[PDB]
Amino acid sequence: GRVIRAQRKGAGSVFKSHTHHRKGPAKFRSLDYGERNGYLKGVVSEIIHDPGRGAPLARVTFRHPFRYKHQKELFVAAEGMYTGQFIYCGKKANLMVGNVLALRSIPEGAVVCNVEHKVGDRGVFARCSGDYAIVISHNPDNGTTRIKLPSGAKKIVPSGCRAMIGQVAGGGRTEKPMLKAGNAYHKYRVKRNCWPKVRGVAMNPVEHPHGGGNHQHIGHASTVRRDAPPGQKVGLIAARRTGRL
Amino acid sequence: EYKRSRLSRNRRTVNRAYGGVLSGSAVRERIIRAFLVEEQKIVKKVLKIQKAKEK
Amino acid sequence: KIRTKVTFHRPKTLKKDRNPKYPRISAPGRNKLDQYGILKYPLTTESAMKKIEDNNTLVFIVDIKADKKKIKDAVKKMYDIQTKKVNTLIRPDGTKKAYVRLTPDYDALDVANKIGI
Amino acid sequence: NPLFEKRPKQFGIGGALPPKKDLTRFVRWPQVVRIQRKRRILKQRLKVPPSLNQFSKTLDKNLATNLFKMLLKYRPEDKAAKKERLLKRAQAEAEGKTPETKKPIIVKYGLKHITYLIEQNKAQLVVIAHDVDPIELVVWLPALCRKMEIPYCIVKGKARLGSIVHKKTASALCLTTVKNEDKMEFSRILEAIKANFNDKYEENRKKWGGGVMGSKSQARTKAKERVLAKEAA
RNA sequence: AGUCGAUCCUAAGGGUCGGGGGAACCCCGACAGAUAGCGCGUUUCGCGCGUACUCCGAAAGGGAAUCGGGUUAAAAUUCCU
RNA sequence: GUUUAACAGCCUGCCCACCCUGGAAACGACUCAGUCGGAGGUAGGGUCCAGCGGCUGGAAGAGCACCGCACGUCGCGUGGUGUCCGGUGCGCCCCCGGCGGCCCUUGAAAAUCCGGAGGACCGAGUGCCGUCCACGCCCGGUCGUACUCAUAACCGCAUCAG
RNA sequence: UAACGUUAUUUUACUUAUUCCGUGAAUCGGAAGCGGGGCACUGCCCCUCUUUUUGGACCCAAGGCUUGCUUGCAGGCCGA
Ligand SMILES: [K+]
Ligand SMILES: [K+]
Ligand SMILES: [K+]
Ligand SMILES: [K+]
Ligand SMILES: [K+]
Ligand SMILES: [K+]
Ligand SMILES: [K+]
Ligand SMILES: [K+]
Ligand SMILES: [K+]
Ligand SMILES: [K+]
Ligand SMILES: [K+]
Ligand SMILES: [K+]
Ligand SMILES: [K+]
Ligand SMILES: [Mg+2]
Ligand SMILES: [Mg+2]
Ligand SMILES: [Mg+2]
Ligand SMILES: [Mg+2]
Ligand SMILES: [Mg+2]
Ligand SMILES: [Mg+2]
Ligand SMILES: [Mg+2]
């Protein structure tokens, strides 16, 4: 008869993201004439740590195309980039790690990261540490390109979408065991209030479908409907299968 | 405490280009880089002109 | 017309100052905080007399709305005496008290005798 | 003299900063401008029924100029002229024993009065503005003029029609009679207007309008057609 | 009390214009938009910049400036020198 | 008990950082720990940075201690002497400097202030144009300020072992 | 399995309704010019928009032509 924890997540106010010390969103430059037709040079000024994010971020300074001022940007750092390196963004940029190129100019089999979904969205795919996308094939007829996402899914995107050559830096982070609850506490302290987690069978019936009973047990199949209403949809949602491979 | 009415000018200034902002070594590096890059730009331009004349 | 800025800015248009046909208030209001309203009465406690004798300072109970500049002006108008500095505080009873120190050119004792304290 | 020299600027991607240019076509316009332009675009794109489409075919420039030159000499009297006439009549009322005055010949304006004159077969020429909003006020007028066999024309500018009759705008104007010295040229203009509008009413009753796409899509369609023709050639 | 604080700044956040909802009390909150204005010279007009909140939010965060000596029954880095 | 405030000037110059000469294996220098050097060490000579460092003015006239004369009811009176010289430290409180360890944790913003790139524009010959220099002149609003802060001044129905 | 007609399911075309994305709405569509290349002979065809050894700087036009009148300077075109 009580709202369950998963339901209470949506309202927020204690489950909102912790973003006080973050350095701002990481994204490409806004797509403009120079990047659409030629190339624009930038210089990496700093590689910084973004709290709550495994991948490091790189500060890049560009010369504004038509204003007398500096154009400052914050890119997701690709492995191998360094302070003082020159970064080239555009259709005519060379195929080197760190450069941002339109997918039409990236040959098949290349390794890219922070791939745009819509032309000009400034990067949504393959952004986490150690992740990358692979260019599969190009379709000149309809101006679309096929890529392989980190999850293994194959997606078709317009060939005008941009991507950064190389893989995201910071790879191999998750292979290290934490060994203790304190490390997880520190990890999630900067992400959101999602830890520790209480098992549903440890609760009373009033606050979870798994609650209750003189023994700890679910008492009914943990696989639930895709259309099950909130508060009832707990456990393995719309599972096509369960158990080991 | 750096306010002009409170601190003498000599105390808050360095008599050199970019004085008080860039160190001496950084200023020297900037000057050398500017000169050499301009020289290489001239060299590239003259090389391109010579190649165009040859062809 | 040639526009060099993509952003549109509202053009500057002429504005006119108010020229009312009638005044909303028929006549200017009276000056409530005049010199007589500012200075209620001198304080004649033992501490006030000690201040008068020692520090050449007069103690007055003053309107709570009066500021130090108004107190100085009111003292000058009422008694024709310069003031070196005015210190003010609000007593626990809710009234304002002012310590008015006269310049060396003026004697506090003579001023107090003239006032009648 | 030898101290003056050229300082050319290399303008390009990554080159010298460009000078001030015309950005008018990229301006983020206010809401009113955007809506008033998109309304015109939408009217162009959609198919216009013949009854509304007939208002896009206005009088020719030369014919319109001639008609308005003729109309300028039949304007209604202004306020000052009316006051002068009234005071003169009052002054000469008793002294002159009310002398007879010739009936004035002026253009007629006002939708009520014009419709009444058309229905009574008194109008000899009907001038209809092409930009009446809402257009339901005059969309039926050509049909009424045709049914009554009254020559009618559609001209550009309700503001101009209003200026004829000393008003901000006029939905339509009518002429019931013309002076003797102007009858032959009025007959010429009437014949021209009848041939242009009244005789083409039946054919225009079935002609739809609109359906015009944008210039970029038009160019794309033209390129596709050219490719197809070249392949078939 | 010009010198100690509030007062100023902004933090988590709060309150809002417009817009969008709402029978309405009200809800979201700069997100549907001709922003506030800011500099130069002046016949006070002209020129040039101008990305929709110049509001609230810390007597422990940031921050313009005071020290001895003396003095009251009771005040002091505030009164006297 | 034998004291020396803010502030002004001069001096000094920690640990670092920086500059000039020079060119190093038989490698050297070096910390409690590290570390550094042909991307220029050791060495010699310098620049800068901190100071809650030193001296002087403030300032002995003040404060403190001691020794006296006097009114002896009301002189908040009157005078003298001294305030000096060294040591010591894994000592305690505070501040600072420079290294090292830790992070799937990297540990605010703004007001405000300083500096810099550029050089449109700008002045004269016995006066003009500038001037963040020194000295001189005037002003500085409003509110809080007593007291307790607790085995009786707050809460716990109290002058309550909480 | 088509002349006529009814019915149902798919495929596909357009963009202005509608929905979504980006921007401080800053070069979008067509064509033509400056340059480079093939052909054969004077025209056709195919291409580009100037920036890639360096942790520098880059704005507020130089120049040419043309008017007011002879310039305190000011007004136009190219440069763009
Ligand atoms: K419930
Ligand atoms: K938690
Ligand atoms: K658990
Ligand atoms: K259960
Ligand atoms: K169980
Ligand atoms: K509403
Ligand atoms: K809002
Ligand atoms: K504060
Ligand atoms: K004092
Ligand atoms: K001080
Ligand atoms: K400067
Ligand atoms: K006090
Ligand atoms: K207290
Ligand atoms: Mg169990
Ligand atoms: Mg605006
Ligand atoms: Mg509203
Ligand atoms: Mg403010
Ligand atoms: Mg002494
Ligand atoms: Mg300068
Ligand atoms: Mg109570």
Side-chain angles (χ1 to χ4, degrees):
Chain A
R2 172 183 277 146
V3 183
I4 70 174
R5 172 191 60 216
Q7 276 183 296
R8 297 199 291 102
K9 300 267 188 105
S13 79
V14 290
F15 305 107
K16 285 181 286 114
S17 181
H18 306 160
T19 58
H20 186 65
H21 290 291
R22 294 189 189 191
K23 313 291 184 240
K27 50 186 169 177
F28 289 142
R29 299 177 63 259
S30 294
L31 195 43
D32 59 2
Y33 179 81
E35 269 194 77
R36 278 194 307 264
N37 301 109
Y39 69 82
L40 295 171
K41 173 171 80 76
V43 59
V44 172
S45 74
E46 253 211 293
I47 285 88
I48 58 174
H49 168 88
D50 184 23
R53 188 203 297 269
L57 304 183
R59 288 192 193 279
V60 189
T61 297
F62 289 89
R63 166 163 173 262
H64 198 281
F66 58 82
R67 291 183 194 273
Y68 180 62
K69 74 207 280 169
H70 289 3
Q71 193 176 41
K72 283 186 166 50
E73 310 286 328
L74 184 71
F75 293 0
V76 167
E79 223 209 320
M81 76 176 30
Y82 59 93
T83 51
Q85 193 201 328
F86 285 143
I87 295 301
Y88 298 87
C89 308
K91 143 166 90 146
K92 316 283 268 281
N94 287 322
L95 189 85
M96 311 213 339
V97 165
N99 288 347
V100 182
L101 274 74
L103 278 156
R104 191 166 16 242
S105 301
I106 301 171
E108 290 155 63
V111 170
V112 303
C113 66
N114 195 39
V115 189
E116 296 186 331
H117 182 31
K118 308 162 195 278
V119 173
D121 64 43
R122 309 166 84 163
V124 293
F125 290 132
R127 285 157 62 86
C128 290
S129 84
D131 276 327
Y132 53 89
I134 288 167
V135 183
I136 300 158
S137 57
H138 303 283
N139 192 313
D141 291 344
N142 47 29
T144 50
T145 304
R146 293 182 183 174
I147 66 181
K148 200 231 264 190
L149 298 173
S151 72
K154 267 86 154 43
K155 176 160 262 298
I156 298 131
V157 301
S159 289
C161 277
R162 284 174 292 161
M164 159 165 307
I165 308 305
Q167 52 167 34
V168 181
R173 167 175 47 79
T174 45
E175 292 158 35
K176 187 183 172 172
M178 320 222 84
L179 310 162
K180 45 185 180 154
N183 289 350
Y185 162 84
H186 287 301
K187 167 171 188 175
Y188 293 110
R189 179 169 50 79
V190 298
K191 280 163 170 288
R192 60 209 74 84
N193 179 15
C194 66
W195 181 101
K197 287 185 203 296
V198 181
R199 290 167 300 109
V201 294
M203 314 198 174
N204 297 306
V206 69
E207 67 241 326
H208 206 277
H210 297 186
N214 285 325
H215 295 278
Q216 261 191 27
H217 69 131
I218 304 181
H220 48 84
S222 41
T223 53
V224 289
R225 286 174 299 131
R226 173 66 76 185
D227 61 356
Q232 189 194 89
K233 178 188 280 180
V234 288
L236 315 183
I237 301 161
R240 301 173 187 81
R241 59 167 310 286
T242 48
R244 293 155 288 166
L245 76 161
Chain B
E1 282 176 301
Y2 290 107
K3 201 152 163 275
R4 294 198 175 167
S5 65
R6 296 174 61 164
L7 188 60
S8 286
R9 182 166 187 178
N10 64 290
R11 293 267 57 212
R12 54 192 145 79
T13 41
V14 179
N15 276 121
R16 178 177 54 256
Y18 292 87
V21 171
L22 293 179
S23 58
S25 73
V27 156
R28 181 196 174 103
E29 298 152 17
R30 262 164 98 108
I31 292 161
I32 290 165
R33 185 176 291 111
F35 170 64
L36 296 172
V37 167
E38 256 71 74
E39 289 296 283
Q40 213 42 12
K41 267 182 207 182
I42 294 156
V43 159
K44 259 195 290 221
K45 182 175 181 178
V46 71
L47 193 140
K48 285 287 289 301
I49 287 172
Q50 284 301 108
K51 271 191 177 179
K53 277 185 182 178
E54 281 188 356
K55 278 190 177 181
Chain C
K1 182 161 178 172
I2 166 162
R3 279 183 179 269
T4 54
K5 284 174 257 194
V6 286
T7 295
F8 182 94
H9 300 279
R10 198 196 69 230
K12 313 302 207 209
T13 56
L14 170 67
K15 305 178 191 181
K16 211 172 287 177
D17 280 333
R18 277 185 175 180
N19 193 31
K21 296 260 187 184
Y22 69 95
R24 271 58 169 165
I25 280 84
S26 63
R30 213 164 21 98
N31 175 31
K32 304 278 192 155
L33 263 180
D34 86 308
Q35 88 246 43
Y36 295 109
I38 288 159
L39 300 179
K40 308 277 190 41
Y41 55 87
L43 196 61
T44 68
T45 61
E46 291 170 18
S47 306
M49 302 343 271
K50 253 181 261 291
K51 290 276 167 55
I52 276 163
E53 182 61 31
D54 282 277
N55 308 135
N56 202 46
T57 291
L58 303 158
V59 182
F60 282 105
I61 300 308
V62 167
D63 198 283
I64 191 166
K65 276 77 132 177
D67 58 19
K68 285 168 178 185
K69 162 94 100 183
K70 274 176 194 92
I71 289 159
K72 190 155 98 67
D73 288 349
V75 160
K76 179 46 147 45
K77 267 182 128 274
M78 197 89 52
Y79 306 121
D80 205 82
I81 59 195
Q82 282 313 131
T83 280
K84 197 193 147 152
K85 71 172 162 83
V86 176
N87 279 352
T88 60
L89 74 90
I90 296 175
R91 300 149 91 196
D93 77 339
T95 54
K96 182 171 274 201
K97 165 163 66 168
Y99 298 104
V100 184
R101 194 206 168 140
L102 303 165
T103 71
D105 309 41
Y106 298 86
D107 195 26
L109 207 45
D110 311 339
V111 165
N113 291 346
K114 274 166 208 23
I115 289 172
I117 66 200
Chain D
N1 201 356
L3 210 46
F4 303 145
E5 91 263 50
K6 308 171 80 268
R7 280 114 175 174
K9 294 184 168 184
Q10 182 151 216
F11 295 120
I13 297 164
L17 284 173
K20 268 172 215 218
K21 288 310 208 342
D22 215 54
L23 278 303
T24 176
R25 88 181 296 286
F26 305 102
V27 166
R28 200 167 186 150
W29 294 107
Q31 197 195 46
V32 65
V33 175
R34 193 206 328 138
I35 284 162
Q36 76 182 12
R37 289 179 191 183
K38 258 143 81 56
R39 187 208 304 130
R40 180 192 83 95
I41 282 157
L42 182 65
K43 276 199 220 147
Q44 276 182 278
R45 298 282 171 284
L46 294 178
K47 278 161 159 30
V48 187
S51 178
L52 289 164
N53 186 44
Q54 79 198 342
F55 279 83
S56 99
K57 289 149 276 171
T58 36
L59 243 187
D60 300 330
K61 192 166 284 298
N62 307 116
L63 254 164
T65 44
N66 297 310
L67 171 66
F68 279 90
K69 156 174 38 43
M70 149 93 63
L71 286 162
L72 286 176
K73 29 182 290 195
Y74 293 112
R75 298 175 71 177
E77 54 176 20
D78 50 31
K79 196 183 71 56
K82 168 162 186 170
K83 210 212 179 319
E84 151 212 299
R85 165 179 71 79
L86 283 168
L87 79 91
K88 246 167 253 182
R89 185 169 64 85
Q91 189 72 40
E93 213 293 315
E95 306 162 12
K97 305 176 186 177
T98 316
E100 291 188 10
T101 308
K102 291 188 176 183
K103 193 196 198 201
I105 298 145
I106 44 177
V107 86
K108 263 67 199 288
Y109 62 98
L111 199 55
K112 300 179 190 168
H113 195 39
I114 288 158
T115 314
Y116 180 64
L117 293 163
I118 293 160
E119 277 163 350
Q120 298 308 284
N121 205 47
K122 302 171 146 223
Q124 276 171 244
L125 173 64
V126 177
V127 188
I128 306 160
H130 91 298
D131 55 349
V132 176
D133 204 44
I135 199 156
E136 288 114 333
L137 283 156
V138 312
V139 72
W140 51 265
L141 246 182
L144 175 59
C145 295
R146 179 89 200 310
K147 185 150 189 64
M148 296 311 260
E149 293 114 317
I150 309 289
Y152 74 93
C153 61
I154 309 185
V155 297
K156 255 159 172 35
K158 57 180 167 183
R160 191 138 88 118
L161 297 199
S163 266
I164 293 280
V165 295
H166 302 108
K167 298 291 187 292
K168 277 177 270 189
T169 56
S171 85
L173 305 174
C174 183
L175 270 171
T176 39
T177 188
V178 294
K179 282 176 147 316
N180 277 313
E181 67 248 20
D182 280 42
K183 284 225 165 108
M184 174 267 132
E185 39 283 52
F186 186 56
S187 49
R188 218 188 320 143
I189 287 158
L190 276 188
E191 232 62 35
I193 283 168
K194 224 185 316 199
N196 257 334
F197 287 90
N198 285 67
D199 292 353
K200 302 189 183 181
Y201 176 94
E202 286 304 314
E203 85 176 44
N204 286 344
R205 258 192 60 80
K206 54 186 88 142
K207 183 198 163 343
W208 280 73
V212 186
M213 296 312 114
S215 64
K216 284 185 230 198
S217 89
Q218 252 171 246
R220 269 178 260 118
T221 300
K222 239 66 76 196
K224 286 190 224 134
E225 292 167 350
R226 280 174 189 168
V227 165
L228 283 175
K230 187 176 180 181
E231 279 185 346

